[PDB]
Design a protein around this nucleic acid. Structure first.
Lengths: 192, 239, 96, 239, 192
RNA sequence: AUUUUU
RNA sequence: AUUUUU
RNA sequence: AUUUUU
RNA sequence: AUUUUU
């Protein structure tokens, strides 16, 4: 039968270990699980499998664009802030808004700003002018886990546009992740 | 033999959208190209995180208690505010209110995150009142809840979902609120969850060496049947 | 091995000694401290080598890398007449 | 029969990127089109190269000894420099230093190439000291190594990974340094490998017809467990 | 058991033949092979299977672009300088940055500059303006092996753009190789 | 309606 | 007319 | 030449 | 790592 513990009478100091799926009941009530969709939208793989805006860059020259990729404190991706460590594939969505040209895109977890000066083997995919691509950067990190908060939690993204004439433009970037491994959930964030 | 026809490559019609980038369906993103040297995968290391496995479902986080409208100081208005941190005092009449307010999911740290992520949800909500008194203090307190109620006013809880709390060794009573809405799925940020009221049933008793008033904490989490559905834009910015 | 055990202890005593339980901190809960106020902290893991009088201080000095697990026991005693509650929580570097 | 529907070509949706050229994944490049007359392959001839098979793995090259910071002249600072070419002299006290310096992968010709190619790596490193003395010369020399050490200063090697070298017929002693970093993979060009010191243990003895000081050479290579991981940009230009 | 030879005591004059995978040990140590990724990044096929920038040409007329292809002393491709001979498929990546036109591309190991004047059968693939292609040139060399260093180690590349109006532009070229056969490793290169 | 092709 | 490829 | 992948 | 989908 039902114990008084499952009827509401408990002790907060006896909750450890963390993660106790204890059932709560009372007459005329029982946990009822009803599904509306064929699958879950709470699963990490599904939720995060959907991109979210990151930032935009307006180029004028053929200079390079180096930016510390990090988890959002803004979109639905904020749900990541509930975790401390991450590891797995990273999907980067880049939109190359230009009349005539090409956009070199690369990604690395390497902090050194000189290993990027060349782009030899940092994944120089080419998005023709007015096009957009979605490259999935592997976990080529030198650290087993990525603190989820760091201003560079995610590796740096590089964008060296190869323009042809006076043409200029802007590169909007949004991103998601493929199968994410989050660990050791931390306390909920505050609001600004 | 099929030599009655000049061999040619297959011809196919290309559907609408030339380079349309679907950033909504996961089944679409996971299939994106790989910048990996050989398009392979890496071996993850959970141990360094002290875990034996990654975290797959987020709902479990929504099922973790968090203080409601937590503050540094207890309710200075006899608990008539949203502060989930107030005081149970001996002075308070046997029917006076120690705390009353309209409950919203955003009033909870953990939940407020999902509120800013998902658009809808469903399931029961559990609130746990923890009164921290001494081993000498004794008394009862009835906390009820009127689902989807909006009028923030003290009212008899005889017809509301209530729980009577008798002080003892386990001074952390709970209360469950079954999903209740006109729909199969309700807004994560819209109509209140209901009216939450904790009235005094029996004056907090004490003695020469025990406190005449104690502190209380109200936590909130989702039930085992909790679910969230559509992810929507954000209504606030975290830090 | 001394067959007479002139030293009655486990042969691996010296080895395990550094993992021994020790007093890491002891601060006084100053009354009139609002909720959320931090009572006391402890530098992990360098605290186990807090002073040269720590069992683990010896070895810790001959190695630069460490990988270990912990078992804390925060003790707070208060007479029955009094009441209150404290939050003992572990905060990884990310949280800190 | 399927004559209830007008036969048509297959329709398909084209993913993001119209002519996106992936120059990162090998699985992508190997599938590129062929300008060959019939898209075929040729028969390679290893014999002309004196080999029986091509070279498939590069790690094996990283496992080939190369002199550290090689120079034309021996260390003119009693070996306190990076020169892997110095002198072992009878005069040097029984504890004085014959060579000390911080070791980096780039200090090795072969390795420095991988340093300019890959971003990270792991595995043990092997250093081989070759002292070239006569059959009459005798003495001992202890060379230690403090992993990831950065302070370039003479220090007792009693706690460091050391190897005592007693001069004989085989005057080329080695020393292995197991992978040691806070990560499962470390920068090919970042934090030092450690402090390398070769102190005198027993003064180099000699006689009327033998040298009072000899030459030494320090080589370095990767262990059998060596690995390199991410290819990165270049930090230097070869010739 | 373990011999003193495997404990560090050896002789440098007894290393031949070249290629001795001798194990090195000492108490509390043994060669530990731990993998982080599902495959090797050291294998010649994989490493070199990834392109690297070569050079860029700015065209104004419909002239032809002849260039001696060679191995890089600059990118990750420099790892080739550790070898003496090469042979196998050659992947050439060309980006045609032009407003309106076509780019004829061809490749040959033939040194004669007249067998190219026409482009009859030298592989004249066509990249429309603003497009980019990756052609894999076969080992159509008259020499069994290609000294890896030669200013023309790799065969010459031809680019005769077919423009329409006053339009002009630039052709950026990068390259990689398909399955490379390297032989007789030589001493490591110097730095500039 | 092998009224896409065998 | 294995006069796409085996 | 499992010198595309197993 | 059915850590694309069953």
């Amino acid at each position: 039968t039902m114990s008084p513990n499952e009827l509401g009478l408990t002790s907060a100091q006896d909750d450890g270990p963390l993660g106790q799926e204890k059932p709560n009941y009372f007459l005329n009530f029982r946990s009822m699980n009803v599904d509306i969709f064929t699958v879950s939208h709470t699963k990490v793989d599904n939720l995060f499998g959907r991109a979210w805006f990151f930032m935009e860059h307006t180029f004028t020259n053929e200079g390079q664009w180096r930016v510390p990729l990090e988890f959002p404190k803004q979109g639905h991706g904020s749900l990541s802030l509930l975790f401390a460590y991450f590891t797995g594939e990273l999907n980067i969505h880049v939109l190359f808004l230009s009349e005539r040209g090409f956009l070199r895109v690369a990604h690395t977890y390497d902090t050194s700003n000189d290993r990027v000066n060349f782009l030899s083997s940092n994944g120089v995919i080419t998005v023709p002018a007015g096009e957009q691509m979605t490259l999935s950067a592997p976990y080529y990190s030198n650290k087993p886990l990525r603190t989820v908060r760091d201003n560079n939690s995610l590796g740096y993204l590089m964008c060296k546009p190869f323009l042809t004439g006076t043409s200029t433009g802007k590169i909007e970037v949004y991103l998601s992740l493929r199968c994410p491994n989050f660990f050791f959930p931390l306390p909920a964030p505050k609001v600004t | 033999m099929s030599t009655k026809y000049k061999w040619t490559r297959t011809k196919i019609d290309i559907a609408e959208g030339p380079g349309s980038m679907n950033m909504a369906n996961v089944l679409c993103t996971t299939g994106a190209q790989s910048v990996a040297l050989v398009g392979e995968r890496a071996f993850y290391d959970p141990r360094t995180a002290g875990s034996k496995s990654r975290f797959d479902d987020l709902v479990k986080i929504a099922q973790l208690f968090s203080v409601m409208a937590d503050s540094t100081t207890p309710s200075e208005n006899h608990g008539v505010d949203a502060k989930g941190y107030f005081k149970w005092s001996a002075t308070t009449a046997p029917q006076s209110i120690v705390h009353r307010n309209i409950v919203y999911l955003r009033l909870f740290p953990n939940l407020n995150v999902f509120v800013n992520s998902y658009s809808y949800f469903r399931g029961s909500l559990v609130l746990r009142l923890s009164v921290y008194a001494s081993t000498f203090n004794r008394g009862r307190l009835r906390m009820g809840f009127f689902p989807n109620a909006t009028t923030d006013s003290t009212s008899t809880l005889d017809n509301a979902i209530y729980t009577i709390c008798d002080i003892g060794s386990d001074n952390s009573f709970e209360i469950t609120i079954p999903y209740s809405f006109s729909t199969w799925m309700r807004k994560t940020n819209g109509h209140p969850i209901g009216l939450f009221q904790i009235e005094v049933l029996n004056r907090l008793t004490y003695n020469s060496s025990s406190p005449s008033e104690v502190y209380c904490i109200v936590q909130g989490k989702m039930g085992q049947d909790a679910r969230f559905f559509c992810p929507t834009g954000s209504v606030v910015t975290f830090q | 091995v001394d067959n007479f055990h002139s030293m009655a202890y486990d042969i691996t005593t010296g080895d395990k000694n550094p993992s021994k339980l020790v007093r890491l901190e002891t601060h006084e809960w100053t009354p009139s401290w609002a909720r959320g106020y931090q009572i006391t902290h402890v530098e992990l893991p360098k605290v186990f080598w807090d002073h040269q009088d720590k069992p683990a201080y010896g070895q810790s000095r001959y190695f630069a890398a460490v990988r270990c697990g912990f078992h804390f026991q925060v003790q707070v005693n208060v007479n029955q007449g009094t009441a209150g509650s404290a939050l003992v929580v572990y905060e990884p570097k990310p949280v800190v």
